[PDB]
Amino acid sequence: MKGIIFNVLEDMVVAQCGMSVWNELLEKHAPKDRVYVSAKSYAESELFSIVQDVAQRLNMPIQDVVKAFGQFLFNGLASRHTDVVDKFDDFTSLVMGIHDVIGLEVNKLYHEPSLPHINGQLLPNNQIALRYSSPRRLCFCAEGLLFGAAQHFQQKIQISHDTCMHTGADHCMLIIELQND
């Protein structure tokens, strides 16, 4: 438990460095007294430092770790909001439906303010254009999630994240393409 985001990640660390390290950087950073749930607040702001700590332990760049957590995050989630997934018959529908159906669905589950700005579209050459913009700059995760989704549905895609606010552009551009286009 403890934050759905931190929950899936907690498990991932239990597999890599183990629960012992998870508690070491957590108790050092996050509170040992305060306990959250897979439905309570989940300030990602703290995550960044967490994915960095563990990254220092795996001796991997923070960008490669966060990316991974994104993939894992889609997996475990498909278990939580599974009913919400069984609404989409394919990877594509999910990409053009993200904020729309999934977001809408989330709102029904809980109040919540507003989800990041996400816009998807379909292309003729079996491609899907996805636009992701958020001040959290968690874009790296975005890719991880998308890549994971496809895999779940036995699909092999490629995401070209050329435009990235990291530069200062209007937003992030994630071009997707289906294998054997």
Q: Catalog residues that contact ligand HEM under the rule CB under 6 A.
A: 42, 44, 74, 77, 81, 84, 94, 98, 102, 106, 116, 134, 136, 138, 141-142, 145-146, 149
Judged by beta carbon, residue 142 or residue 157, the one nearer ligand HEM is 142
Judged by beta carbon, residue 52 or residue 116, the one nearer ligand HEM is 116
User: Which of 94, 119, 92, 116 has the alpha carbon at shortest distance from 173?
Assistant: 119
Min separation Cβ 20 and ligand HEM, Å? 27
Min separation Cβ 18 and ligand HEM, Å? 26
Q: Over the range 95-106, which residues count as b (16 or more CB within 10 Å of their CB) and which as e?
A: bbbbbeebeeee
Min separation Cβ 148 and ligand HEM, Å? 7
CB 120 within 8 A of CB 95: yes
Judged by beta carbon, residue 58 or residue 165, the one nearer ligand HEM is 165
Chain CA centroid to CA 27, Å: 24
Q: What end-to-end distance do the CA atoms of the chain give, in Å?
A: 40
User: Which of 3, 155, 153, 38 has the alpha carbon at shortest distance from 86?
Assistant: 153
Report the distance separating Cα 170 and Cα 167, nearest Å. 9
Min separation Cβ 23 and ligand HEM, Å? 23
Judged by beta carbon, residue 19 or residue 90, the one nearer ligand HEM is 90
When CB distances to ligand HEM are compared, the closest residue is 136
